[PDB]
Structures are given as C-alpha cells and as structure tokens.
C-alpha cells in the first residue's frame, strides 16, 4: 500500500497544496466523521479528480446489495488498475460538501482503443433518506453523448421518458426504488440509478469483446456496460471511469 500524506476535502484540494502524483490519498469531506482513502487522478495542469468508480477487466462482480453499494467494494490500488465502487455514502459526502459545485466526468473506453467523455455540471448524490438520488443541472458535453437524458431505443414512445437518469433514486436488487413494476436492478444484475430501466448503465455485466447477444442473458436483458448514446445497447465497454472535480476546473 502507499497512501500519500497531503490530505484535503477532496482531490482538488489535494492538488492545490502541491501533490503532483496520481495515487492513494486520504480526504475527509466536510461531514465525514473520519478520513478515507480515495484514488486521485492528478494531471499536469493541477486538475485533481476524485475517482469513485472504475471498470477495466471483470475482476469484481457488480451485483452487490444495498449495504455493499452504500459502503463500497472492490479494491483501491496506487497504480489505478483495480475495479471498485467507492461507496454511495462517500460519494454523497463529497459531492454535497459546502455546496461546492461539482462536475461529473464519465470516461469510456472501447475494445478498439477509442476513449469518449461525457460531462455533467453540478452533479450531486443525495443522502440515504432519499435513496442516494442522482441529480445534476445540465450536460456539459463530450463525445459519448448524453445517455443520462434518456434514449429512444425505438421499442416505445415513452422509451426516452423511461430511460432518463436525472432525479432517479439508487436501486439494488434488494432495494427497488425504480419506476418499473419489476425490479430493474435485480434483472440486470447491478446497482444503479434505475428508471425503466436505463440508457446509461456502467455497473452492468462485463462482457468480453464488447458485442454481445440477447442470448448471453436468458431473459433477454440488455445488461452490459452500455452508454446508449455512444454505442449500441449490445456493446459492453472495455473500461469506464466516473470521477468528480469542482466545476470551475472545466
């Protein structure tokens, strides 16, 4: 292990104090009773992103329950080569500290080497009392497209209405808070901000190769790691990163 000494409210505070290496740092957001390890992605321009989700090789099963998604799972590595979910409580403590305006960057990688981005301005994750609801002001751009706005796959007219993510509470197979009369989290095997059900799903099943069929899932669920706006629902991503930085850094 190798956590760095400089600490802060987040990874940007950390970069502001001079840290120039990406790695494990301790941070203690405004309402954190205690500090905690995070992986900071620090680029040359002083930008310090607090990474809260990472997918890259299929080593961790993302079908976890409420308490597991609340507390975090997977492993943090100084080299940034492990998969993990920081925890809904920590993501909440950071994104809502001191009303600081945060931007969320979703970074995606192909099975063909191509990387795409999608930024969301004023990103926040509510408290447990409101089931860690996801809310943001507006899409700030990026080539991955805006999957969080919903998507008209074609299946129905209300598809868009039903696959948008803004305002959605979090759902795990054992804590269904979606807008579907079935259980989305349970049938797609993940923990996510489900509507009915999704156009962007980064905690889905890791499918080797990207392209996958309706058969690879007996009940025809499109449950891969998809971002409807960039790739087909039958294309599971190679790598995904969800990280946050104060809006002004954009």
């Amino acid at each position: 292990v190798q956590i760095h000494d400089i600490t802060g409210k987040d990874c940007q505070d950390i970069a502001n104090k001079g840290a120039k290496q990406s790695g494990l740092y301790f941070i203690k957001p405004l309402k954190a009773n205690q500090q905690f390890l995070v992986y900071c992605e620090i680029d040359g321009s002083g930008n310090g992103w607090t990474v809260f989700q990472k997918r890259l090789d299929g080593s961790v099963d993302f079908k976890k329950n409420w308490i597991q998604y609340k507390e975090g799972f997977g492993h943090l590595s100084p080299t940034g080569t492990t998969e993990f979910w920081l925890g809904n409580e920590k993501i909440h403590l950071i994104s809502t500290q001191s009303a600081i305006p945060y931007a969320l960057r979703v970074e995606l990688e192909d099975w063909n080497g191509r990387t795409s981005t999608a930024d969301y301005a004023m990103f926040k994750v509510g408290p447990e009392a409101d089931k860690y609801r996801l809310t943001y002001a507006y899409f700030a751009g990026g080539d991955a497209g805006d999957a969080f706005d919903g998507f008209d796959f074609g299946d129905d007219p209300s598809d868009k209405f039903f696959t948008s993510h803004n305002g959605m509470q979090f759902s795990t197979w054992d804590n269904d808070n979606d807008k579907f009369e079935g259980n989305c989290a349970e049938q797609d095997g993940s923990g996510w901000w489900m509507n009915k059900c999704h156009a962007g799903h980064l905690n889905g099943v890791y499918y080797q190769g990207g392209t996958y069929s309706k058969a690879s899932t007996p009940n025809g669920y499109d449950n891969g790691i998809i971002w409807a706006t960039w790739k087909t629902r039958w294309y599971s991503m190679k790598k995904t990163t969800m990280k946050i930085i104060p809006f002004n850094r954009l």
Binding site: F153, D155, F162, T163, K196, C197, R233
Partner: peptide, 4 residues
C-alpha cells in the same frame, strides 16, 4: 434499455 426500455421495458413493456
């Protein structure tokens, strides 16, 4: 994706 969507649902019924």
């Amino acid at each position: 994706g969507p649902r019924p």
